[PDB]
């Protein structure tokens, strides 16, 4: 349940969080949006009187690592070798905590395929799909689901390598994009509604937030670049049916082993039925970004949410 | 086909300067170390530029001095077999044997491991989990006895006990607590042990184990002189080919890549029950993959080199 008193915990003391290392960047498709966000989240902690210094993580990491001291690493880093469970075990084995979800929680929340399989053998709702490796399975998919589909690589972000697909040749095309990021492709049935997303924190479902773009998704452009999106919070949902979305992500993000935070995506139809889509384990922080959104909701600022982040990493 | 087995272990060179990781930190580092010895001397012998690391606090700045083409993960345990050590190597830049973060991850947390087996309907024992003594009472009531208490990230029989009553199931389960706050209780399988390692996704003969020991525990592991191997395994070729087979769904269900070796009891009725699999296997002399790798032809050096060609993919 949110509470607002028990998120702040080891808030108080900034200097009790010793040299913290804030790591971002990376060499993942998702670098921009990482730099943004590790920039957000090093000002505020700088400001909140932290040992904060930044890490473009790149080829020199590990020199970094052994050359700086460091107590606390903040992992704000978007996509694979970041989300996927690699950084959380070198620094397990640097013997640096951090924040966030473990290594197992990470790996499986980053695959999108696995991360569906986890929720369906557990009776979660979550859209039909298939897994598109030739020309022959996306026939195949596109007889069995119909159409419109939505294409993305399973572990990818930001919507990238992603497409809104209403024909056979639309979707071999989409397939062919996808496979330029990521040799696991799946294709997923559309889900036509309002579409929701539910951050988590130290265990806490935060207030949702409904999304609304006139582009054909939520894609890259509506999340960085554009300027007509629409973010609606208090999401127009009624009492039991925002406390059903609510267990709905602390199910879905406990199936996974979230810790520390998240954030989930999750559509619903004509008929409000939920359906989830994915759990990001590194969300991002940026000006645009939707968990300091839900985080100002709560009722922190983009100072108290991250100095929450940092004070959960302490368990 | 033992053609298979051993493609791409022709030119010892072609792999480089190869870093055996081995010792660690966690309960098992005894037996990593001779784990390691072994992977190391025979590689020195095959013609391969090999050298050791005992992994440590020191770990990092040793990467960063070493030039390495390419690792060979021999570490036991949690820091070695989770994922942990191979989502170092991925941000290091450095290849690696064995199964991903994924997998060894997963593989190593005996719980979700026999999770991800029961939802595709493979056999495993009867459990509960433990966190209390009243999770004793309960598993007690429901599964009867004897049973057998494991922690749930451990190998190499640590912090394990057979209990025949409640007053020791509850002595057992605060025992595996000190190593591991994730505590299971299976109910215990009387009839034959089985083991069954896989390599470069075939999966080698089966190896039947006995030991005087109420089970096949640390010291029956590594220390007396009376354990029982068997290969061939008495079985029948229907029965063999079928534990084979079972031991093929069991390691593809959980990802495992490269190598890995399967531990599965056999009840009164001939049911095959499966217990866990490990993701870098014993390579000690006492270990069980030398000796599957033996009853398929291959010798050490060959298993070793196996290994590491099938890690350049
Ligand atoms: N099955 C679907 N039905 C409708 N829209 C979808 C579906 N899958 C994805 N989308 C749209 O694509 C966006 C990105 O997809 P998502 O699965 O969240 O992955 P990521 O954001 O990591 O690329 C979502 O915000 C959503 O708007
Ligand atoms: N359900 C069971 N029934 C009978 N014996 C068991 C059972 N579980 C474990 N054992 C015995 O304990 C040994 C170790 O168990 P295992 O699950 O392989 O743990 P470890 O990872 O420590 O080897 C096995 O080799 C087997 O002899
Ligand atoms: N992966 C992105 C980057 O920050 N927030 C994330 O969530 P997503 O865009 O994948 O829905
Ligand atoms: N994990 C141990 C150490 O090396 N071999 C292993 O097999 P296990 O004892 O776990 O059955
Ligand atoms: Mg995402
Ligand atoms: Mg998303
Ligand atoms: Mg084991
Ligand atoms: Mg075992």
Known sequence: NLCLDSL???????????????????????????????????????????????????????????????????????????????????????????????????????????????????????????????????????????????????????????????????????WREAARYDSQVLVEQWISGPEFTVATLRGQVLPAIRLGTPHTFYDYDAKYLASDTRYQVPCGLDEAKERELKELTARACDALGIQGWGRADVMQDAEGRFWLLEVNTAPGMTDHSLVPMAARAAGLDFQQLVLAILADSRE
């Open 8 to 174: 702040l915990n080891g808030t108080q003391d900034p200097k009790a969080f010793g040299r913290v290392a804030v790591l971002f960047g990376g060499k993942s498709a998702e670098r921009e949006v990482s730099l943004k966000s590790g920039a957000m989240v090093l000002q505020s902690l700088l400001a909140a009187g932290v040992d904060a210094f930044g890490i473009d993580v790149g080829e020199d990491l590990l020199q970094r690592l052994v050359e700086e001291k460091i107590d606390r690493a903040f992992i704000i880093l978007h996509g694979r070798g970041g989300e996927d469970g690699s950084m959380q075990g070198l620094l397990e084995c640097a013997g640096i905590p951090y924040t966030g979800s473990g290594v197992l929680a990470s790996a499986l929340a980053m695959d999108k395929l696995r991360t569906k399989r986890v929720w369906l053998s557990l009776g979660l709702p979550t859209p039909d799909y298939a897994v598109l490796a030739s020309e022959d399975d996306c026939r195949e998919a596109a007889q069995r689901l119909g159409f419109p589909l939505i294409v993305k690589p399973a572990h990818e972000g930001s919507s990238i390598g992603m497409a809104k697909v209403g024909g056979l040749d639309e979707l071999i095309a989409a």
